[PDB]
Design a protein around this ligand. Sequence first.
Ligand code: MCM
Ligand code: K
Ligand code: K
Ligand code: ZN
Length: 357
Amino acid sequence: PITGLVYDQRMMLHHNMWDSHHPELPQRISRIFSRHEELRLLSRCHRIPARLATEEELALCHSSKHISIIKSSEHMKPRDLNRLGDEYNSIFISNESYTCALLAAGSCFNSAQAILTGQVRNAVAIVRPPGHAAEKDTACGFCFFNTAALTARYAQSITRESLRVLIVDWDVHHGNGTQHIFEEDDSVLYISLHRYEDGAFFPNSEDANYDKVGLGKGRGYNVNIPWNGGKMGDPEYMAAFHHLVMPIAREFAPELVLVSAGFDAARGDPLGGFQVTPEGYAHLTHQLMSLAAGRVLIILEGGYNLTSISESMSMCTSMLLGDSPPSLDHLTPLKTSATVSINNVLRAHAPFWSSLR
Ligand SMILES: *Nc1ccc2c(C)cc(=O)oc2c1
Ligand SMILES: [K+]
Ligand SMILES: [K+]
Ligand SMILES: [Zn+2]
């Protein structure tokens, strides 16, 4: 087995011209890459080149209007960049933003290709800006184009349309964009774990609740696991994987796993408020490696404590490389509301999955 890694410092050029301290910082990716060097993980990986996604590739998931509007920002004056950015929910834009989003996407396409052609078994993508909040027709939540969603469709474009792709989204935020793009689609199983707080947590929509199970032929293929009323950590995420994520995923039998890997559920994250440990992420990564004959691609999404995300994503890469997984405490009692959450999701999805019955 070989593990691929893609990283390009050019993606640091996307920046906030009006608030240089905005948490979606350029140094998120450079700090993660540096940690891979410090831990001697980088040389253990096969380096995969970044590339620009093409406009035709963006059209796999996004409208021509949305593509054209974001493209138009590459040469805008500051005043217009500011005005355009303010038209979205939680977006900043610089002249380099469009190109960086193209690079984030193209890097993941190259990574998916390396996996599917057999050049590597699995891979990690240290990319920014993030993607999972980006919708077909709009930008949102620091995201312009939906990198993971696009990567699923790209993967299908070089194998077959119905290639089974599992997207596991453990960013602490709901991937509203990914849900919507695949809501009526039974070829892409979307499973998100996220803080919800009955709608008080970003992005503040009931679309993130457990009863949104998908639409039409996609009924059953959208699994929301929403957290309420508690500081969740390793026990809760481990239980969700044991009762929900893994039984459903095994029954789906994916041919490729994409992880929307935000590390903002990590201990120390200022936006997330949760306490998943780097061993917790390691455990989750090792679990997903049991699927799809190990074909797993880990795509950076959110995560804003620089030391936390650096250590957390490095531990995931360590697992992909075959290092020994952590033994954690599966007997620690869950926060009471987490049990309620897991039970609500189980009730919602039992009609669609025999493994839950
Ligand atoms: N959405 C959002 C934007 C900016 C933030 C800062 C600067 C700090 C923080 O703790 O949370 C934020 C959340
Ligand atoms: K999520
Ligand atoms: K789906
Ligand atoms: Zn997030």
